[PDB]
Design a protein around this ligand. Structure first.
Ligand SMILES: C[C@@H](Nc1cc(=O)n(C)c2ccc(Nc3ccnc(Cl)c3C#N)cc12)c1ncccn1
Ligand SMILES: C[C@@H](Nc1cc(=O)n(C)c2ccc(Nc3ccnc(Cl)c3C#N)cc12)c1ncccn1
Ligand SMILES: [Cl-]
Ligand SMILES: [Cl-]
Ligand SMILES: [Cl-]
Ligand SMILES: [Cl-]
Ligand SMILES: [Cl-]
Ligand SMILES: [Cl-]
Lengths: 125, 5, 125, 5
């Protein structure tokens, strides 16, 4: 209907609760392995944030896997920063991590993150 | 909160 | 870190994708039964929006159920309107449905929805 | 969009 009212803060309040569930390991259904490191998450949140995870978890075989191994070239700290961004909207971008965050966001297919990384690098040239 | 979207 | 940047639209863009997954029946993990009607959903979204579903899906036995039956007094249209609100932030509140939406929101423990229903009823007295 | 929160 075109006669709906809207609760402004609803989407933000939902995302905060999804991050609380992740913190407490409640109903997490996949482990992402990045070299020696492991990260527990919810497949639906990963798909909602990333073109790579959307493709993986809509595949008729990969949708049922409980472990996904990323390319060995991916930096674990870069992945951790992006997983935190998926669950909070906040990106911890610093001089010391920007190259790893940008390469990881290109692999994960997160376009707006790639674009702000490019802008911050260009400003320092 | 509530608004007209 | 206190040095994070924030993408304003991120939470809203995530919620839109969760509703698209529900529309296409992708990775839905529970059926909610309301008398003769059935509704497919994601347990994590239900818990993030409702005090009743948060209690149900954190229980050591009920967390594993694939079907949940609601009280026979609950109106299916009232439940459908609230499920759509959970996945969109938009509430289709009308003269013809407000009493059923308010009773359903009290049962589901959705406080801000109960509060706007009370305000709209009081204005018509 | 990006802002200082
Ligand atoms: C939240 C964030 N998501 C995405 C950012 C991005 O760069 N790419 C390339 C994505 C590619 C695919 C998806 N996932 C879906 C796409 C279409 N339909 C569905 Cl059902 C899903 C799901 N789940 C999400 C993203 C964003 N979206 C839009 C604007 C900004 N940020
Ligand atoms: C999105 C909406 N959620 C809720 C509205 C509401 O009236 N009640 C009583 C709730 C009760 C419980 C929960 N769920 C949780 C609570 C604490 N910690 C966790 Cl991990 C979860 C989860 N998942 C959500 C709601 C809202 N929250 C805050 C303000 C407005 N709307
Ligand atoms: Cl918290
Ligand atoms: Cl597996
Ligand atoms: Cl992005
Ligand atoms: Cl759509
Ligand atoms: Cl069952
Ligand atoms: Cl609410």
């Amino acid at each position: 209907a075109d006669s709906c009212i809207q609760f402004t803060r609803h989407a933000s309040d939902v995302l905060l609760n999804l991050n609380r569930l992740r913190s407490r390991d409640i109903l997490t259904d996949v482990v992402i392995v990045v070299s020696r490191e492991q990260f527990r998450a919810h497949k639906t949140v990963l798909m909602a944030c990333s073109g790579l995870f959307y493709s993986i978890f809509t595949d008729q075989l990969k949708c049922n896997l409980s472990v996904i191994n990323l390319d060995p070239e991916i930096n674990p700290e870069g992945f951790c920063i992006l997983l935190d961004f998926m669950y909070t909207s906040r990106l911890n971008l610093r001089e010391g991590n920007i190259m790893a965050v940008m390469a990881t966001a290109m692999y994960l297919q997160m376009e707006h993150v790639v674009d702000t990384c490019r802008k911050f690098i260009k400003a320092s040239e | 909160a509530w608004v007209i979207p």
